Design an enzyme around this catalytic site. Structure first.
Site, PDB file in Angstrom:
ATOM      1  N   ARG A  42     -51.950 -27.688 -68.080  1.00 36.23           N
ATOM      2  CA  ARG A  42     -50.740 -26.895 -68.251  1.00 36.23           C
ATOM      3  C   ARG A  42     -50.675 -25.626 -67.404  1.00 36.23           C
ATOM      4  O   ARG A  42     -49.587 -25.139 -67.103  1.00 36.23           O
ATOM      5  CB  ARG A  42     -50.574 -26.526 -69.720  1.00 36.23           C
ATOM      6  CG  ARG A  42     -50.372 -27.714 -70.644  1.00 36.23           C
ATOM      7  CD  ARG A  42     -50.291 -27.231 -72.070  1.00 36.23           C
ATOM      8  NE  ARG A  42     -49.887 -28.276 -73.000  1.00 36.23           N
ATOM      9  CZ  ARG A  42     -49.595 -28.048 -74.275  1.00 36.23           C
ATOM     10  NH1 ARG A  42     -49.666 -26.814 -74.762  1.00 36.23           N
ATOM     11  NH2 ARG A  42     -49.227 -29.051 -75.060  1.00 36.23           N
ATOM     12  N   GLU A  53     -47.859 -20.963 -75.511  1.00 42.46           N
ATOM     13  CA  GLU A  53     -49.040 -21.408 -76.253  1.00 42.46           C
ATOM     14  C   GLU A  53     -50.397 -20.944 -75.715  1.00 42.46           C
ATOM     15  O   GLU A  53     -51.446 -21.481 -76.096  1.00 42.46           O
ATOM     16  CB  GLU A  53     -49.025 -22.935 -76.411  1.00 42.46           C
ATOM     17  CG  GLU A  53     -47.756 -23.436 -77.089  1.00 42.46           C
ATOM     18  CD  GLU A  53     -47.860 -24.861 -77.595  1.00 42.46           C
ATOM     19  OE1 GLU A  53     -48.481 -25.702 -76.912  1.00 42.46           O
ATOM     20  OE2 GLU A  53     -47.299 -25.143 -78.677  1.00 42.46           O
ATOM     21  N   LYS A  64     -66.569 -16.246 -81.895  1.00 41.25           N
ATOM     22  CA  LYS A  64     -66.818 -15.986 -83.309  1.00 41.25           C
ATOM     23  C   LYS A  64     -65.570 -15.343 -83.916  1.00 41.25           C
ATOM     24  O   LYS A  64     -65.407 -15.313 -85.137  1.00 41.25           O
ATOM     25  CB  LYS A  64     -68.012 -15.043 -83.493  1.00 41.25           C
ATOM     26  CG  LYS A  64     -69.368 -15.728 -83.386  1.00 41.25           C
ATOM     27  CD  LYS A  64     -70.501 -14.739 -83.603  1.00 41.25           C
ATOM     28  CE  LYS A  64     -71.829 -15.464 -83.753  1.00 41.25           C
ATOM     29  NZ  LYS A  64     -71.831 -16.356 -84.954  1.00 41.25           N
ATOM     30  N   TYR A 105     -50.250 -35.679 -87.639  1.00 46.75           N
ATOM     31  CA  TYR A 105     -51.573 -36.247 -87.437  1.00 46.75           C
ATOM     32  C   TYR A 105     -52.728 -35.589 -88.189  1.00 46.75           C
ATOM     33  O   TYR A 105     -53.851 -36.088 -88.146  1.00 46.75           O
ATOM     34  CB  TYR A 105     -51.891 -36.319 -85.941  1.00 46.75           C
ATOM     35  CG  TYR A 105     -51.513 -35.093 -85.145  1.00 46.75           C
ATOM     36  CD1 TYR A 105     -52.242 -33.910 -85.254  1.00 46.75           C
ATOM     37  CD2 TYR A 105     -50.430 -35.122 -84.266  1.00 46.75           C
ATOM     38  CE1 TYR A 105     -51.902 -32.783 -84.502  1.00 46.75           C
ATOM     39  CE2 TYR A 105     -50.081 -34.005 -83.513  1.00 46.75           C
ATOM     40  CZ  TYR A 105     -50.821 -32.839 -83.635  1.00 46.75           C
ATOM     41  OH  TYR A 105     -50.475 -31.733 -82.890  1.00 46.75           O
ATOM     42  N   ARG A 155     -40.917 -34.882 -84.009  1.00 49.27           N
ATOM     43  CA  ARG A 155     -41.847 -34.520 -82.951  1.00 49.27           C
ATOM     44  C   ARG A 155     -43.196 -34.127 -83.557  1.00 49.27           C
ATOM     45  O   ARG A 155     -43.804 -33.137 -83.153  1.00 49.27           O
ATOM     46  CB  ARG A 155     -41.284 -33.365 -82.113  1.00 49.27           C
ATOM     47  CG  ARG A 155     -40.277 -33.792 -81.045  1.00 49.27           C
ATOM     48  CD  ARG A 155     -39.606 -32.582 -80.411  1.00 49.27           C
ATOM     49  NE  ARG A 155     -38.630 -31.986 -81.319  1.00 49.27           N
ATOM     50  CZ  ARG A 155     -38.153 -30.750 -81.207  1.00 49.27           C
ATOM     51  NH1 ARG A 155     -38.564 -29.962 -80.222  1.00 49.27           N
ATOM     52  NH2 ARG A 155     -37.263 -30.303 -82.084  1.00 49.27           N
ATOM     53  N   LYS A 213     -41.302 -26.489 -90.235  1.00 57.42           N
ATOM     54  CA  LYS A 213     -39.853 -26.280 -90.083  1.00 57.42           C
ATOM     55  C   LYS A 213     -39.043 -26.571 -91.352  1.00 57.42           C
ATOM     56  O   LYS A 213     -39.478 -27.313 -92.234  1.00 57.42           O
ATOM     57  CB  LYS A 213     -39.284 -27.208 -89.000  1.00 57.42           C
ATOM     58  CG  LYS A 213     -40.061 -27.291 -87.708  1.00 57.42           C
ATOM     59  CD  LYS A 213     -39.468 -28.355 -86.788  1.00 57.42           C
ATOM     60  CE  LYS A 213     -40.285 -28.501 -85.511  1.00 57.42           C
ATOM     61  NZ  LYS A 213     -39.805 -29.628 -84.653  1.00 57.42           N
TER      62      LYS A 213
END
Ligand SMILES: *[C@@H]1O[C@H](CO)[C@@H](O)[C@H](O)[C@H]1NC(C)=O
Ligand SMILES: *[C@@H]1O[C@H](CO)[C@@H](O)[C@H](O)[C@H]1NC(C)=O
EC number: 2.4.1.102
Lengths: 364, 374
Positions: free
Chosen positions: B204, B270, B291, B308, B328, B351
């Site tokens: 990304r 992200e 840590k 998932y 999604r 959501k």
């Protein structure tokens, strides 16, 4: 300032390099305390114990302590005084192998307070063995049945010292909103021999016998942690009464360092009060938990370069940092309730400065 | 009270299997799905008379405690549609002492924007961002939308303590007082997901991305390493940061360099915040040592159920199955998800959707209002 307790502490607390270098013999014996405590009123006054709650907020949030000790009476007295408040409860577990004068000195101090006592059951603690866990369980039993109002139990050892005032502790505990707080992480497979084999105390040392143990008596996986915790009274009542937990504890009796997995594991068992799900998303490292700030030699380094904390300014004992005055400044900025370990023989100034600081801060 | 808000929400919040089943059958009813819904034009009119809007919708226009008055919070709300949900969300988090910046996507219907401006005009501390972006999924513009609100909020008032960013599908699970208390408990530190960068998320930022046919896509061009000494961390678009952090992000040169570098990466939202949170000297940051990593569950920013991961909690799953529907891979909460959700420590959850389960929102909404008025 009558309750306040040749190095400039403020400079030390500010991390002043000048004083750090500048800093880097009379002592009461058990018999001095045995005599000194005969007159509780004077002992309390001269030692400056606080025998009146400081705020209504603290009166409404009682804390219980399990203190496991075996020597160094002056350090126990100093630790007790630093954490002592009339509304709290203090169980002191004196190792059965301790010197009789030490036991007498501890009873001497304890006998001056209706909320300080010696555990009803005492163990002969062997390093890394179940007996170290049993010591805290003995105190848990006494503390749980003696009062139903304390909110949390914090276990300590003789070389611990708080880095927060009682009020600051109370506030962080309220911040936990009924949850327990202790290190609890996915168990590294490489430590499996600690519980896959049976251990026996051989010639004073717990050793691997090679005898194969059955699998842990629980659905939940084992988790890695610390001997130190901050748990709700409800967690304690559950540990003391729940059948499945009893089964887990009896299975753990012949494992290596059960203290480093028992509490952390129970904290992930469903239905245990204040627990977290077993999913690793909820794991808490020693730094993210607030139980105890401890520096390990192999982790110290450049904080701005990936190190969890700065190098030790005192000395290392078995890879653990025994704090020096130079460790204080950074340490005080962490969120932990207590820190380990301290030793008057290594750096008495690290203690004095911290002790004076917390007392002044508390008297504010 | 004039401020309180056939289903028994009390039972739902308690996880009553019977009451939950009842709401699910209610949702299926033709009568329900064919119920009148408000339109952006309805709000444009209703907000014509602000005094009437405020009274009718039951917005709280007076601080509830001195504690809350002394701890102002700022919000950055990124939205593009569903005005009723924006109304419910704003009302649920609105307090006169706080600040609210709403970023309406430039591609939102002209009527939606008008409606939002209408609602905002009714509160001096609620406004539409001074710069509106056309947000493309996974692009830098999503981050820019928040940066736009950060700038407006930072300059508007110097007294707010923390900034919490939200989207139109979020909803609080804590009252303003509860939020204030958790923020005080943070002791000047920020709180957001920030963990060691997973190997499967490196592509990304290793390559330049460009919008092709409406979607951000890998150009194949390799970009230079990030302008940072510390590593890049993985996280979420949602955070809880101090005003000091915001000021530093808007001013500091090195951060500026980091952001320009991240402009052509995939889903910079992200990793940017998560990474900045571990840079030494950034106000409220944590050391880069792993840590100090915070997972989505250990951070308090947002409770989200991923398809998932859902499962038997008493067997390793971080949370129970979705009682609503998945979109999604993300769970759109149903009334059945509320009981367990309310026991978590997060400030907000995502959501929610009144087209999926309006009762999930209603029961939560009534509970928080009642809890706050106590
Ligand atoms: C909802 O049910 C609970 C008991 O389950 C009750 O206390 C509450 O009053 C009920 N609400 C109404 C309006 O009937
Ligand atoms: C109020 O809104 C309605 C639509 O709901 C619109 O037709 C009407 O023109 C508005 N009222 C007026 C005339 O200002």
């Amino acid at each position: 300032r009558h309750l306040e307790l040749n190095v400039n502490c403020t400079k030390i607390l500010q991390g002043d390099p000048e004083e750090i270098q500048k800093v880097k013999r009379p002592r009461w014996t058990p018999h001095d305390y045995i005599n000194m405590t005969r007159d509780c009123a004077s002992f309390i006054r001269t030692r400056k114990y606080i025998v009146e709650p400081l705020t209504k907020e603290e009166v409404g949030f009682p804390i219980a302590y399990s203190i496991v000790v075996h020597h160094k009476i002056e350090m126990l007295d100093r630790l007790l005084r630093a954490i002592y408040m009339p509304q709290n409860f203090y169980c002191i577990h004196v190792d059965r192998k301790a010197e009789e004068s030490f036991l007498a000195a501890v009873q001497g101090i304890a006998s001056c307070f209706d909320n300080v006592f010696v555990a009803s059951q005492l163990e002969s603690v062997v390093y890394a063995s179940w007996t170290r866990v049993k010591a805290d369980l003995n105190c848990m039993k006494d503390l749980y049945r003696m009062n139903a109002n304390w909110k949390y139990l914090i276990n300590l050892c003789g070389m611990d010292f708080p880095i927060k005032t009682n009020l600051e502790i109370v506030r962080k505990l309220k911040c936990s909103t009924g949850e327990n707080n202790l290190e609890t992480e996915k168990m590294p497979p490489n430590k499996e021999e600690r519980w896959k084999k049976r251990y026996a105390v051989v010639d004073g040392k717990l050793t691997n016998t090679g005898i194969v143990k059955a699998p842990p008596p629980l659905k939940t996986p084992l988790f890695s942690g610390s001997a130190y915790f901050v748990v709700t009274r409800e967690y304690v009542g559950y540990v003391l009464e729940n059948e499945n937990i009893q089964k887990l504890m009896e299975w753990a009796q012949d494992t290596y360092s059960p203290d480093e997995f028992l509490w952390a594991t129970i904290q992930r068992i469903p239905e245990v009060p204040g627990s977290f799900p077993s999913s690793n998303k909820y794991d808490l490292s020693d730094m993210n938990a607030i139980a105890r700030f401890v520096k390990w030699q192999y982790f110290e380094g450049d904080v701005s370069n990936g190190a969890p904390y700065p190098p030790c300014s005192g000395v290392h004992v078995r890879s653990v940092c025994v704090f020096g005055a130079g460790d204080l400044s950074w340490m005080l900025r962490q969120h932990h309730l207590f820190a380990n370990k301290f030793d008057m023989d290594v750096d008495p100034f690290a203690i004095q400065c911290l002790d004076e600081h917390l007392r002044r801060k508390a008297l504010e």
